[PDB]
C-alpha cells in the first residue's frame, strides 16, 4: 500500500515560496537550488524572477511559478492577462492569480469569472491557480468564487496570499474542497510551517502547499 | 496653515484589497467636498473616480506594480499605458527592489523611465520605499528618478514595514532639490505627522485620515 | 481542536501604556482592566510602579517596566540602579533596551556587560532584554539576542514601540531561531489585532506587548 | 546679529537612539568648527565628548530621563550624578508629566530640586514638553522650576508630538521673567525660525541644523 506519507511524495505538494519585495538575485538563487535539492514541485516567485528561475531550473523537474496580480487583485482583467502572458513567455509554466475582491462585494460574478478566464486564456499551456483570499471574503463568497473558477477552467483554487490579515484554514481548505470536488484542485497557502500543518491541509482536500518553510516541513515528517 | 493650502497636500487614498465600490465612491465624495489634491486608488477604480470626480479640481492617481514593484518593466508600463487611457492624472509606481539590491542602478533608471514614458501626461510618482532600502540606496534610487524624468519620489507603499519618516523626507528633497517633488505616505495619522513630513520638504501627503488631519490643526 | 481560546490567549498579554503624558487615572484603568481579564502584567513607565504594585496585590498580573527607555543611551550602572529601585518599588519584570551605539561599534562584549547590569540588579524581578529590530540589521539581531542569553535575561524582545516600526513575524522568528528554548521572545509594537498576535505567537513568541489587548481578545477567530 | 554671536545660541544636537561613534565624533569635529555653544548627547557619550572638547569652549550638555521623564526623581538624581562625574557641563531633564496632570505641582518641583541638587556645578535645564501641557499647566510648571533652582526652561524633547512654537517660548519667557532662561527645541531648520525664538525670549536654541541656521543668515 503507499504507506505513510514520506519525503518523495510530500514534496511534490510543496510550492517553495519567495515573494518579498526586497527579494535579492542571491535569495532567489538559494530558492532554486534548494527546491532542486528537495525535488519541490515549484518555486514560486514574483514576475521579474520567472526567467532567471526558468533557466536554472531547467532539468531539474522543478516548475516555475508566478503570481499575477499579486496580492491585492486590484488591477483591470486585461493588465492581469498581459503579466500572465509575458510570464509565460519567461517560462512560467504556472501562474497564480489574484481575484478583483471589488467584482465579489458588488455581486459582480459574472465579471469575477471574466476576470479569471482573462487570466486563463493568457496562460496557454500553464497552469492556472485563483487566489481567492479567504481572509476577505465570506463563506458564501468564497463558494460562488470557487464556482467561477471552475467555470472559467481554472485548475487550481488557491485559499490565501500569504499578506493578507491571515491564511490558510483546514475549514477553507475543506469548504473549497467539497464546492469543486474533482472539477478543480485547491492549494492551501499563508503560514503552514510545519509537516503537522501541511498535513491537516492535505488531509482537507489540498493538492498542493504554499509556504516559505517546505525545507522545515519536508524535514518533520515521522 | 489654512485648510484650503493644507488640503491640496492631500492625497486621499483608498487602496487595501477588499475596497468596495461604495467606500471608493465615498472617498471621491470626501475629496470634492474637502477639496484634496487628488484620490489614490487601485487601478481597477481609475474608470470610476475618473467619471465621479471630471470637473472637481481634484486629480485621479493610481498605483503601478503595487505594492511590490517585483514585475517586468514592461508589464509597468501596460498597467501605465491602461491607467492613463482610463483616466489616471498621476501613477506612483514601485520600482524594482531587487534592481537596487543588485546594484543595478541603470537598470533601476530604465524601469522607472518605461513608466515615465508610457505615462505620457500624465505625472509619475515614484515609490522607493524607504523601510527596505538603506541611506545610500534611497539617495541613489532618488537620482535615478530624476534622470528617468519622474516628477515625483515617494517614501512608501504604506504596505511594507512602515512608511514616512521626516529624515526620509528631508534625506530625499535634499537629494533631489528643486528637480523634483516629494510625497511622503503610510503612518501620516495626524496634523502633528502631516507637518512634520511637509516641514521637512514633502509637496504631497498620502493619506485615509485627511479629514481628520485638516480638523487638527493647531 | 485546540485552537485559541481568551483564558490561553490572555497569559500572553503585557497590557501597556508608555505614552509620556500617562494619567493616574489611565493607569489605574489599565490595571483594572488587567485585572478583570487576567493579562500576564501591566507594562507601565518606572513612576507608576508602586501604584500598580499596590492595585495588583492578590490578583496574579504582574508588575512590568521598562529601563533605560525607550532610547537605551545612559550608562550601565545607571540602567541597573532604575532596575533597583524599580525592583525595591514593586516590579516583577523590567524591560531594558540595550546601547545600540555599543552594537554598531561591534562592541559586543560591552552589551553583554550592559545586559548583565541588569540582570544583576533585577534580582527577583524577571528582565527581559529591548532589541529595537527596526534599527538593527540581522546579523546584529542574532548577535545581540545570543549576548542576552549569555547574560541570563528571561527574554528578548523585539520592540520599544517608539521607534520607525515594531514587531514582524520574521523578527520574532529570527530571535527564536538564535535562542531556542534558552530565552523567550516578546513581540511588541503596533500589534493591534487578534491576527497580529497569532502572527508573533505562531513564529516564537511568548508574550505580547500592546495596548489593545480586549480588542485582541474579542478578536479571536 | 553675525555668525559668531548666532552660533553661540546653538546647542548642536544628536539624540537618536542608533547613534554611532562616527556620529558623535562629527558632532564634536562640527561644533568645535563652528564653536557652536555646546554638543547635546545622550548620556551614554558624555565622556566621549568631554574628551573631545577639552580646550575648545564648546560645553557638553546631556538629557535626563529623557524623552519619557516617567522615572522617579531618585533615578533622575543618579543619572544626573553620573552624567557631571563624567563631565557634563549642562543637563537637560524631563518632567514627569503625570504628576502635573495630578496637580502634584509639590511633586513636580521636588522632582526638579533632585535634579538640580545633583548638577552640582552643571547648569540645569527643564524640558516642559509643551506639546502635552494646557498653557496653564507650562505657567505653573515654569514657576516651580524657578522655584526649585533651575536656570533654564525648555521648551521640547523634539521627540513629541510637535516642538517649540513662537508662543510657548513667549509665555515661558513672561513666566520666569530674568529668573531664569528659555531655551527653545524641535523644530528649528532655518536662520528666520531661529531668530523668531530668540526675539521671543529664547536664550538657548537646540538643533540639529546649526550648520544650516549659520548659513542661512540673511
Ligand atoms: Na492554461
Ligand atoms: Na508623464
Ligand atoms: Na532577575
Ligand atoms: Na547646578
Ligand atoms: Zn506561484
Ligand atoms: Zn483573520
Ligand atoms: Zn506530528
Ligand atoms: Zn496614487
Ligand atoms: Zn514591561
Ligand atoms: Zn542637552
Ligand atoms: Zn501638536
Ligand atoms: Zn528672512
Request: with cysteine; glycine share 10%; net charge neutral.
Amino acid at each position: 500500500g503507499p504507506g505513510s506519507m514520506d519525503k518523495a511524495t510530500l514534496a511534490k505538494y510543496i510550492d517553495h515560496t519567495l515573494l518579498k519585495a526586497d527579494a535579492t538575485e542571491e535569495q532567489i538563487r538559494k530558492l532554486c537550488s534548494e527546491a532542486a535539492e528537495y525535488k519541490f514541485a515549484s518555486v514560486c516567485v514574483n514576475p521579474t524572477w520567472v526567467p532567471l528561475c526558468a533557466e536554472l531550473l531547467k532539468g531539474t523537474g522543478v516548475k516555475v511559478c508566478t503570481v499575477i496580480g499579486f496580492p491585492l487583485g486590484a488591477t483591470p482583467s486585461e493588465v492581469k492577462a498581459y503579466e500572465t502572458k509575458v510570464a509565460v513567455e519567461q517560462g512560467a509554466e504556472e501562474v497564480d492569480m489574484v481575484i478583483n475582491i471589488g467584482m465579489v462585494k458588488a455581486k459582480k460574478y459574472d465579471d469575477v469569472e471574466k476576470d479569471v478566464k482573462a487570466v486563463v486564456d493568457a496562460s496557454g499551456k500553464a497552469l492556472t491557480k485563483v487566489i481567492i483570499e479567504c481572509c476577505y471574503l465570506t463563506n458564501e463568497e468564497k463558494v460562488e468564487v470557487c464556482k467561477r473558477c471552475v467555470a472559467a477552467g481554472a485548475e487550481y483554487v488557491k485559499t490565501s496570499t500569504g499578506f493578507g490579515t491571515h491564511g490558510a484554514t483546514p475549514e477553507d481548505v475543506k469548504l473549497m474542497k467539497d464546492t469543486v470536488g474533482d472539477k478543480a484542485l485547491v492549494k492551501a497557502a499563508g503560514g503552514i510551517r510545519t509537516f503537522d500543518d501541511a498535513m491537516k491541509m492535505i488531509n482537507n482536500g489540498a493538492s498542493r502547499i504554499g509556504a516559505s518553510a517546505g525545507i522545515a516541513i519536508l524535514n518533520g515528517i515521522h
